[PDB]
């Protein structure tokens, strides 16, 4: 009932670090990796795709420097199209928006969109999703 991984995106260490904690207290996971930006995530998601390897589950600040997690989204459904439905996807934003819900609720490479950090119920639907794979 472990779950494979998940690769953090966020250009923000100490929440990277937070998040990681919290999935830790939550003795499901595997393993856990963190970049801090949308083309190293390109790089290492690439790097990965090279491998069995896809993350079990993938978190997204929206708010970065350089291109934003819309634009790496964006990039994904371009680059990435294999794995469309090999992943989950959380989308985090400090603030919480109304109009990027929405597109997270269309958009069928986001399969979720909360607050930043993680939360221990936002993790356990993660993982629920990963198992109703």
């Known amino acids: ?5 998940v690769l ?8 990277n670090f937070l998040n990681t904690t919290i999935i830790r207290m939550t003795h499901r996971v595997e393993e856990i990796q963190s970049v801090t ?7 290492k998601l690439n790097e990965l ?11 997204i600040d929206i708010n970065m420097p350089g291109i934003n997690g819309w634009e790496l ?22 603030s919480l928006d109304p109009r990027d819900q929405a597109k997270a609720e269309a958009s069928d ?3 979720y969109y909360v607050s930043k950090p993680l939360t221990a119920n936002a993790l356990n639907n993660l993982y629920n ?4 794979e």
């Not at 009932?1 to 991984?5: E, H, N, P, T």
């Not at 930006?37 to 790089?43: E, H, K, M, Q, T």
């Not at 999703?129 to 109703?132: A, T």
Request: charged share 25%; proline share 3%.
């Open 1 to 5: 009932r472990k779950i494979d991984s």
């Open 8 to 15: 953090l995106i966020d250009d923000d260490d100490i929440v």
């Open 37 to 43: 930006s949308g083309n190293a995530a390109i790089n």
């Open 49 to 59: 795709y090279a491998a069995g390897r896809w993350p079990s589950i993938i978190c």
């Open 73 to 94: 989204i964006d990039l994904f459904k371009q680059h990435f199209q294999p794995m469309k439905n090999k992943s989950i996807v959380c989308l985090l934003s400090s």
């Open 109 to 111: 490479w986001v399969d």
């Open 129 to 132: 999703k990963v198992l109703n």
